[PDB]
């Protein structure tokens, strides 16, 4: 059964609720982004209307084979009417095609669902500036002050300079990047670009990347592994066994692997600066874990909320424990008292 925090009251609508069967009274299913915890339950047999971005609709059609007739793509930053209710989609600064949804209820309430997001000051000059939001359904993934990480710009800078140095010292080194869902594409794209190579990958991953409307993509990626010196692999293979094995297959083209695991947050953020990060090494294989996040830091989240000044906040992440729920409610109150709303 569908939880309350996936329901938009006063409407026929749910959000990211595809794993509950037929939801009683839901007449349109919104999907915020193509990550499996959120799409769970969609397939080619789904027969109700789905509303989402263009990119999210490309993946629905090509990867889960949902029939065209039920996919309803919407443009961003545009007032649209759905079953008599005004809605707007906004960039969530998460993975490709990830949106926030504004619902303008018939009775005058305004609701913002962030879906998954990385808060940014640039959202303060979206169509959010123009009016008041009563309810915020918030991605509270890193809602605790210990969650700090660098900007995405600093992390990419670290990865580019690391890879460029290594390969210029040893032209026979191969660079490998771990992946398991969409998002974080900039990690492997920016590395390839500085190395003058295309990114090589399996057919299934190539297909996935072909749905994301990235400009000049055909110039950046390929299925011919032999022609590329940056290879993508499944995240589970980004370990010393997985990498030695993969090196066998390259057939004596390369004598060194430099690999990157893009994670979210890890406790080595409590002590270490991005500049100071070092790999784990075994023989001719080094692995760097790098804190490239697509969720709000605690401070980025706080700023966004204190700008928005919502009347009520409903968390969508970390909701299954009382300790979490209680901790989050305390920060909400602090933030409200500090800013004075
Ligand atoms: Ni996500």
UniProtKB/Swiss-Prot annotation:
It is found in: Nucleus. Induction: During mitosis. The mRNA encoding this protein contains an internal ribosome entry site (IRES) in its 5'-UTR. This 5'-UTR generally suppresses translation while specifically promoting expression during mitosis, when cap-dependent translation may be impaired. Expressed in brain, heart, kidney, liver, pancreas, placenta and skeletal muscle. Changing residue 139 to N: Impaired nuclear focus formation, reduced interaction with PIAS and increased sensitivity to cisplatin. It comes from the Eukaryota. May be required for DNA interstrand cross-link repair. Also required for checkpoint mediated cell cycle arrest in early prophase in response to mitotic spindle poisons. Possesses beta-lactamase activity, catalyzing the hydrolysis of penicillin G and nitrocefin. Exhibits no activity towards other beta-lactam antibiotic classes including cephalosporins (cefotaxime) and carbapenems (imipenem). Binds constitutively to TP53BP1. Binds CDC27, which is itself a component of the anaphase promoting complex (APC). Binds PIAS1. Belongs to the DNA repair metallo-beta-lactamase (DRMBL) family. This is DNA cross-link repair 1A protein. It comes from Homo sapiens (Human). The chain holds residues 700 to 1040 of 1040 of the full protein.
